[PDB]
């Protein structure tokens, strides 16, 4: 019915008016490319050949467009159509008369997409503003869209079968709009959290930690090769940190050349000892933490997620705030290229050698588990004797579960801490966790020491069978193994009952992901529809379509969210 | 023992039987995170391999068969009953967990191009097209014949030379996209000759015809099935996954010279990023690499039953130490480009890698001024129909946030469904307009002078007319 057509989603009101299928759009699998800049995207030749951007013939560009017309559709840098002044369209594929090929001012040649054509790159779902960013086009000879790895974080895209949509603006006006509002370098900093959206990620973060250690010393030829990939190099080789006996540069010395201009920033490495700041060696840090950059030169410190990641006050954030968006784009690209070419010399890996720990550490983990199981048994025996006293506001069952969970959690964390102590400097799990590129202390703990308690619906594994979790366990068993505690690590291997309980926990995780996607989508749409028309007028009042004043100044101070920074008032706290 | 239960009434035959068919192919499942076993269960269904030994006789749509399937070097005992050895899906690959050039970052994979040349992960894709000569029409007969442009009033400019006299292309003839696999003609009633009814190859198939069959179907009409074969050498978009839930595309392909090489000369067939392992906690992958190295040297297929208690990482490591390698499986690697030893020692070992059905060639689409829908006069939908990608409502909200009003206008009006209507000034309702006659008149007012041209999306015109059919009057007044 008419109402049926209009009412539902994919009806005329929403599925054909608010959103609709569009021309000049392309889609294919995305794959990484470290060599491409932040703003560049790699487009396959076939996609570039099908898509055409009309160019008006001017006296300036008549020769170039004439050559493109002569090439035709077959040769790649060719023109698919010619649009005359009358509006007549001469498809060059079917034979055009040599008279038709002649061009005059006012004709519009539809050339194939070429290097440097601005396009809009999208990945569904388009949760935030950074999910549609304008990319320059670089044609490369394979059939996948290729984008730089730092740009993955705004799109929330990884290259495991993902796909993205490519929209080519078809007019100079809309092309300029994209170029000056939505290009990737212009949207490095999000107004949502006044933090940079994009940060150094994956191999480059892990390798920048290793590159910036005090230990790293680079000989002459390695310095040559690293400087070769630096786009903004002045052409002057920095004086080596160690002139004699053999000239040896340092990792920080080369990274200082990457740092744009003169940027001043002080950040702390992840492994920074808390007592260091109060005690001596506060400035001459013993662990080479407390990153300090003065005059755009890395005086000291080990870079990590905190310094080069997506957090307020990061080196990239200070670069965007101070130097500008263009120099910051060059900064991202140069970090990636130089550090990735050093990683060929150094290299990274993950092996079983990382998971395995010392025998003493394994014995300590086992002893912690033994005494924890004994403590749980003592709590159970107290509960059976009714000696246990109920916690205020909780039933005896609830307080028994609370105490048992506390004992098991303390044991789990203690075994994890022992495992994390066992890790050597060379351990690669530690490299990735310390750098912040991937993983967490919890993952190391589960890999090495103890997987941990499996909880479903906020409780230990429930009694699915009559008064027992699995048929193998005895009725009314509230002990650690029966209710889900997985003593073995992933490396050690889960016992079969622990395997089933672990599967139960993982299933809860999967279900939560599936549910959250839909519910969050509905919430986001409703918020947008409620506040879509609100904008800052030229009075700088924030008004809706009705012209009712939502706010007299935007944010009550009339400032945009990206420019602001965290600061301390310093008059508030001190005593009189 | 210390008394727990003295009244056992039944015993399990083996705990590994709790797993199903797809989860049984996972080696060392107990050493993986649970969501990763779940993901491997789904990826294994999509792997490529010889699906059945009678595949030559069968004419199925979308049948992929790998050139050189291999059975796993590290196999579960329960795989034998699943017949995975008889019909394997995947190839054991020398896999190095390393960061080489940054093209293996995220989940992507650097593959050896020389190995690809030698048959590594090569597959064939058979597509079958069926057509039925239907004489059921009263005066319509869908005869099989080669259409002729002069004889047939309805015809297409795609290549018709391939078709033989029967209208069916002979096996062994290459077919490029937009070529006529089968030529069929419907005789046209002469109300007062021919509307073309040939079937055309899916774009970019680029295959060679394998088998052409002519039979009579259930209805008794002549039935023709044509199977087209396309070899599929792996590319830099194809999706490869191991048995432990690690899926990823091929970032780039380096030749044997460029790949890092051990002192023995072994270069990894596949290089995966080290960053995949820790967050996903798929240690089963690492133990499978170690057991595969031990098995390839020893010559016995490794056992990876989930719950064994006789196979430990330490025992595997000692066994490998006997065969001359580092006990944890790491190997000293040399950089292919420069020859210098890589300072960190890379973990290299054979690992069963699979090839999934998802490939870049089947997933690449580009649209520019294509056909439009009848109802909405908007671009079609789908790769088969050359459909444009949808600019959803979330996308338009992002564009509003940008402030790119003119890009939003182009994308939502000018690129999709541009249209013009004539609207009376006195009454907002649209008015009849004869451009060729140059006479524009509005019914209901008897007014000709006051008419204005309005540019609106065709979908909006359809919306307003549907409102009018419901007796609502959407009077659009320029004033």
């Amino acid at each position: 019915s008419l109402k049926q057509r209009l009412k539902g989603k994919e009806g005329r009101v929403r599925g054909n008016l608010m959103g609709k299928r569009v021309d000049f759009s392309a889609r294919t699998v995305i794959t990484p490319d470290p060599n491409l800049s932040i703003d560049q995207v790699g487009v396959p030749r076939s996609i570039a050949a099908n898509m055409t951007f009309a160019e008006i013939v001017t006296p300036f560009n008549i020769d170039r467009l004439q050559e493109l017309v002569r090439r035709g559709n077959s040769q790649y840098p060719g023109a698919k159509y010619i649009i005359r002044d009358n509006g007549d369209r001469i498809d060059l594929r079917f034979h055009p008369k040599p008279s038709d090929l002649h061009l005059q001012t006012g004709y519009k040649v539809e050339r194939h997409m070429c290097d440097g054509d601005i396009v809009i790159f999208n990945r569904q779902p388009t949760l935030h503003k950074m999910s549609m960013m304008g990319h320059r086009v670089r044609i490369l000879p394979w059939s996948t869209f290729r984008l730089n790895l730092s740009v993955t974080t705004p799109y929330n895209a990884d290259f495991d079968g993902d796909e993205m949509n490519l929209h080519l603006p078809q007019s100079l006006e809309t092309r300029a709009e994209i170029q000056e509002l939505a290009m990737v370098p212009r949207m490095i900093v999000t107004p949502q959290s006044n933090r940079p959206v994009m940060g150094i990620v994956q191999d480059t973060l892990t390798a920048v930690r290793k590159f910036t250690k005090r230990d790293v010393f680079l000989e002459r030829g390695e310095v040559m090769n690293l400087l070769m990939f630096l786009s903004t190099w002045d052409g002057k080789v920095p004086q080596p940190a160690i002139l004699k006996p053999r000239p040896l540069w340092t990792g920080k010395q080369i990274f200082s050349l990457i740092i744009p201009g003169h940027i001043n920033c002080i950040r702390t490495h992840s492994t920074h000892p808390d007592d260091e700041d109060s005690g001596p060696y506060k400035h001459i840090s013993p662990g080479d933490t407390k990153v300090v950059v003065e005059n755009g030169e890395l005086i000291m410190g080990i870079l990590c997620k905190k310094s080069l990641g997506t957090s307020a006050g990061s080196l990239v954030h200070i670069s965007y705030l101070e130097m500008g968006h263009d120099i910051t784009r060059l900064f991202y690209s140069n970090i990636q290229t130089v550090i990735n070419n050093w990683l060929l010399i150094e290299g990274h890996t993950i092996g079983i050698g990382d998971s395995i720990a010392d025998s003493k550490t394994y014995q300590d983990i086992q002893n912690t588990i033994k005494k924890a199981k004994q403590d749980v048994i003592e709590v159970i025996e107290k509960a059976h004797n009714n000696e246990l006293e109920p916690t205020p506001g909780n039933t005896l069952r609830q307080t028994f579960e609370n105490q048992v969970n506390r004992i098991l959690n303390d044991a789990r964390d203690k075994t994890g801490s022992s495992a994390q102590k066992s890790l050597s400097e060379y351990n690669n799990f530690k490299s990735m966790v310390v750098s912040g590129a991937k993983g967490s202390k919890i993952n190391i703990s589960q890999v090495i020491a103890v997987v941990g308690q499996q909880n479903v619906e906020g409780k230990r594994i429930p009694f699915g069978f009559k008064h027992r979790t699995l048929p193998h366990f005895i009725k009314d068993d509230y002990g650690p193994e029966s209710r889900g505690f997985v003593e073995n690590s992933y490396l050690a291997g889960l016992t079969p009952t622990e395997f089933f309980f672990h599967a139960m926990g993982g299933r809860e995780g999967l279900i939560d992901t599936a549910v959250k996607t839909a519910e969050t989508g509905y919430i986001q749409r409703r918020l947008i529809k409620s506040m879509e028309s609100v904008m800052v007028k030229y009075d700088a009042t924030v008004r809706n379509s009705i012209n009712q004043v939502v706010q007299l100044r935007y944010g009550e101070d009339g400032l945009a969210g990206e420019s602001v920074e965290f600061q301390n008032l310093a008059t508030l706290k001190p005593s009189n | 023992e210390v008394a727990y239960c003295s009244t056992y009434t039944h015993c399990e035959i083996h705990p590994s039987m709790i797993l199903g068919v797809c989860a049984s192919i996972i080696p060392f499942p107990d050493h993986n995170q649970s969501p990763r076993n779940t993901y491997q269960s789904a990826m294994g269904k999509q792997a490529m391999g010889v699906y059945i030994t009678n595949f030559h006789v069968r004419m199925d749509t979308l049948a992929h068969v790998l050139y050189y399937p291999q059975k796993p070097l590290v196999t579960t005992r329960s795989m034998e009953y699943l017949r995975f050895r008889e019909l394997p899906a995947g190839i054991n690959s020398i896999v190095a967990i390393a960061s080489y050039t940054g093209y293996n970052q995220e989940d992507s994979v650097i593959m050896n191009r020389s190995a690809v040349d030698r048959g590594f992960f090569r597959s064939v894709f058979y597509r079958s097209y069926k057509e039925q000569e239907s004489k059921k029409g009263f005066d319509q007969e869908e005869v099989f014949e080669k259409p002729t442009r002069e004889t047939c009033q309805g015809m297409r400019h795609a290549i018709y030379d391939k078709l033989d006299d029967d209208g069916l292309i002979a096996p062994g003839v290459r077919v490029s996209g937009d070529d006529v696999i089968i030529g069929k003609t419907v005789t046209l009633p002469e109300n007062e000759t021919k509307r073309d009814c040939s079937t055309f190859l899916r774009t970019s198939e680029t295959g060679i015809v394998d088998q052409v069959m002519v039979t009579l179907n259930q209805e008794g009409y002549k039935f023709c099935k044509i199977r087209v074969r396309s070899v599929r050498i792996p590319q830099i978009g194809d999706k490869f996954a191991s048995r432990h839930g690690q899926k990823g595309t091929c970032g780039i392909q380096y030749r044997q010279e460029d790949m890092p090489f051990t002192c023995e000369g072994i270069t990894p067939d596949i290089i995966i990023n080290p960053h995949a392992i820790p967050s996903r906690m798929t240690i089963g992958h690492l133990i499978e690499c170690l057991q595969g190295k031990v098995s390839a040297n020893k010559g016995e297929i490794g056992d990876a039953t989930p719950f064994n208690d006789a196979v430990n990482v330490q025992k595997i490591s000692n066994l490998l130490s006997d065969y001359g390698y580092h006990l944890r499986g790491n190997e000293v690697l040399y950089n292919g480009f420069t020859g210098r030893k890589i300072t960190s020692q890379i973990f290299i070992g054979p690992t069963y890698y699979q090839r999934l059905k998802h490939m870049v060639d089947d997933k690449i689409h580009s649209r520019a001024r294509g056909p439009i829908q009848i109802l909405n006069r908007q671009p079609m939908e789908g790769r088969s129909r050359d459909g444009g990608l949808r600019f959803g409502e979330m996308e338009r909200d992002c564009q509003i946030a940008h402030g790119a009003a003119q890009f939003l206008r182009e994308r939502l009006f000018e690129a999709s469904d541009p249209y013009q209507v004539h609207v009376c000034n006195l009454c907002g309702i649209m008015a009849i307009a004869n451009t060729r006659t140059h006479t524009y008149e509005c019914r209901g007012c008897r007014n000709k002078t006051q008419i204005s041209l309005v540019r609106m999306p065709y979908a909006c015109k359809l919306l307003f007319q549907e409102l009018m059919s419901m007796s609502i009057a959407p009077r659009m007044m320029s004033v």
Binding site: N405, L408, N409, R412, I442, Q446, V451, G452, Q453, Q454, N455, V456, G458, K459, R460, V486, H502, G505, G506, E508, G509, D512 | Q33, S34
Partner: peptide, 8 residues
């Protein structure tokens, strides 16, 4: 899969 306070 860790604990009651963590993740499943």
């Amino acid at each position: 899969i860790w604990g009651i306070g963590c993740n499943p």
